[PDB]
Enzyme design. Structure first.
Site, PDB file in Angstrom:
ATOM      1  N   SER A  28       0.871  -1.156   0.124  1.00 47.77           N
ATOM      2  CA  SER A  28      -0.093   0.104   0.010  1.00 47.77           C
ATOM      3  C   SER A  28       0.889   1.188   0.034  1.00 47.77           C
ATOM      4  CB  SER A  28      -0.897   0.086   1.025  1.00 47.77           C
ATOM      5  OG  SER A  28      -1.704  -1.160   1.365  1.00 47.77           O
ATOM      6  N   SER A 106       3.114  -6.804   1.602  1.00 48.72           N
ATOM      7  CA  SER A 106       2.083  -6.324   2.544  1.00 48.72           C
ATOM      8  C   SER A 106       0.827  -6.597   1.862  1.00 48.72           C
ATOM      9  CB  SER A 106       2.493  -4.983   2.553  1.00 48.72           C
ATOM     10  OG  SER A 106       1.546  -4.454   3.748  1.00 48.72           O
ATOM     11  N   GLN A 107       0.043  -5.562   1.282  1.00 50.79           N
ATOM     12  CA  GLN A 107      -1.306  -5.618   0.328  1.00 50.79           C
ATOM     13  C   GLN A 107      -1.206  -6.564  -0.676  1.00 50.79           C
ATOM     14  OE1 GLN A 107      -5.250  -3.517  -1.798  1.00 50.79           O
ATOM     15  NE2 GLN A 107      -3.826  -2.235  -0.655  1.00 50.79           N
ATOM     16  N   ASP A 161       6.765  -7.811  13.110  1.00 51.18           N
ATOM     17  CA  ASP A 161       5.936  -7.263  12.102  1.00 51.18           C
ATOM     18  C   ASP A 161       4.388  -7.594  12.625  1.00 51.18           C
ATOM     19  OD1 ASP A 161       4.425  -6.403   9.926  1.00 51.18           O
ATOM     20  OD2 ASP A 161       5.671  -7.312   8.337  1.00 51.18           O
ATOM     21  N   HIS A 174       8.246  -3.955   9.645  1.00 47.77           N
ATOM     22  CA  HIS A 174       7.279  -4.037   8.619  1.00 47.77           C
ATOM     23  C   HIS A 174       7.978  -3.572   7.426  1.00 47.77           C
ATOM     24  CE1 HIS A 174       3.972  -4.959   6.016  1.00 47.77           C
ATOM     25  NE2 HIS A 174       3.877  -3.621   5.757  1.00 47.77           N
TER      26      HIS A 174
END
Length: 198
Positions: A28, A106-107, A161, A174
């Protein structure tokens, strides 16, 4: 483009097929269609296979990598899944014999996972390896991509994370996947390609 955007599959055609096609979904808010980690994996892949031997394609188009989409059921939007699904379809149509490899942060790691899940099994079989960093559905999926073999999956989820443990809180681990994208993640993908192709 900039090192942050790679459209080798979109711009490629059957006469210039690479042996290996890498499809990668960024986190993101990241720039281009590769973000921060995608260019380091790409550089390593081109050392191993040569510039002509690998196509790198970031997931763009309808994948806007909106922070609010993280809260949707599959961890991303339906539109984004269809975008990634269509790039695997296009790889398969343009270059039926290329080995596919995939990745996401991530996303983009939830997107990779939902896309591979929904993929036709014959195309899915061609994805020799998938690397996922700060996988937002790591806990929910118990470190796996649905309908995809454990031996072809490598998840990098740092300790601390918190997105790997069921939340969406962003903590400093993260943001620490740079080492992994330079070393173990491309090595894993190269080893998986070599085990299929020689």
């Amino acid at each position: 483009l900039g090192r942050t955007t790679r459209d080798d599959l979109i711009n490629g055609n059957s006469a210039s097929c690479a042996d290996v096609i890498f499809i990668y979904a960024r986190g993101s808010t990241e720039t281009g269609n590769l973000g921060t980690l995608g260019p380091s994996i790409a550089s390593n892949l081109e050392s191993a296979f040569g510039k002509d031997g690998v196509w790198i394609q970031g997931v763009g188009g309808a994948y806007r990598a909106t922070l609010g989409d993280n809260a949707l059921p599959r961890g991303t939007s339906s539109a984004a899944i269809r975008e990634m699904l269509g790039l695997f379809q296009q790889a398969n149509t343009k270059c039926p014999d290329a080995t596919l490899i995939a990745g996401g942060y991530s996303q983009g790691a939830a997107l990779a996972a939902a896309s591979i899940e929904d993929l036709d099994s014959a195309i899915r079989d061609k994805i020799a390896g998938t690397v996922l960093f700060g996988y937002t559905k790591n806990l929910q999926n118990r470190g796996r991509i649905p309908n995809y073999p454990a031996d072809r999956t490598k998840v990098f989820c740092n300790t601390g994370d918190l997105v790997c443990t069921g939340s969406l809180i962003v903590a400093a681990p993260h943001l620490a996947y740079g080492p992994d994208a330079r070393g173990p993640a491309p090595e894993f993908l190269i080893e998986k390609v070599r085990a299929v192709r020689g």
